[PDB]
Symmetry: C2
Subunit: 141 residues, 2 copies
């Protein structure tokens, strides 16, 4: 699933859906001809570059809004850490044995130290790309 | 009207609705007991301080989202500049004779120089507070 984000709340480093792919934004520019914003991002899964321009709508008189789509992050519990991947569990009890962890900003070591400190409190934020799941951030409940 | 904003897209300086008032965020903190985020902001109209904590929802299994409300900005054309206030016009032709301009980050002088340069291209972004309107930013179409 996706969420609509207003463009004035998008900054470098945010994760957006570009060309149907979840990407980390690395450049923001503005089109001189249309006024749309252009977003250059890095595919979280393949590391390829993608670009997409914003969507302009007029839902009411005197209201002009530019939006992009962002992913809906899922929150899983961490049951075990095994060799780069983790054993995760959904809120309903569905067990995921080999969930990969992205190599971005030392997430694995941040996750490792919080797990040994408070296993039951650690959560991973997960994105999906047409069936494939990956942990891209962590949270402490 | 308002728009729902995810908390991970809110940064210092953003404008949110706090306690029913539009405010510029000046401090973001996290509640140790609940995990909610707390936002301290400055009322754009009265300059008083207000604080509000985020709303936590669970719209689906394994989906936890924290949101705040932001204002829906209206876009008016600038017909004339008169003594701190401006004559503005909506997209449907409704004329507003004495629209005030906020004193934040030298908006009046930024608006003044763009008006003399390209009057027809200048737009002001306007917020409403239970009937009262004020220009809080500008745009060039």
């Amino acid at each position: 699933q996706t969420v609509t984000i207003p463009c004035h709340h998008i900054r470098l480093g945010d994760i957006l859906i570009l060309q149907g792919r979840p990407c980390q934004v690395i450049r923001i520019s503005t089109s001189a001809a249309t006024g749309q914003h252009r977003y250059l991002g890095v595919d979280l899964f393949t590391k390829q570059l993608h670009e997409e321009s914003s969507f302009v709508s007029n839902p009411a008189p005197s209201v002009v809004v530019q939006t992009m789509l962002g992913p809906v992050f899922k929150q899983y519990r961490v049951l075990d850490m095994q060799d780069g991947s983790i054993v995760a569990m959904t809120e309903t009890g569905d067990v995921k044995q080999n969930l990969p962890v992205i190599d971005q900003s030392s997430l694995w070591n941040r996750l490792q130290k919080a797990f040994e400190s408070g296993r039951g409190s650690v959560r991973v934020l997960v994105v999906s790309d047409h069936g494939r799941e990956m942990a891209v951030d962590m949270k402490v409940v």
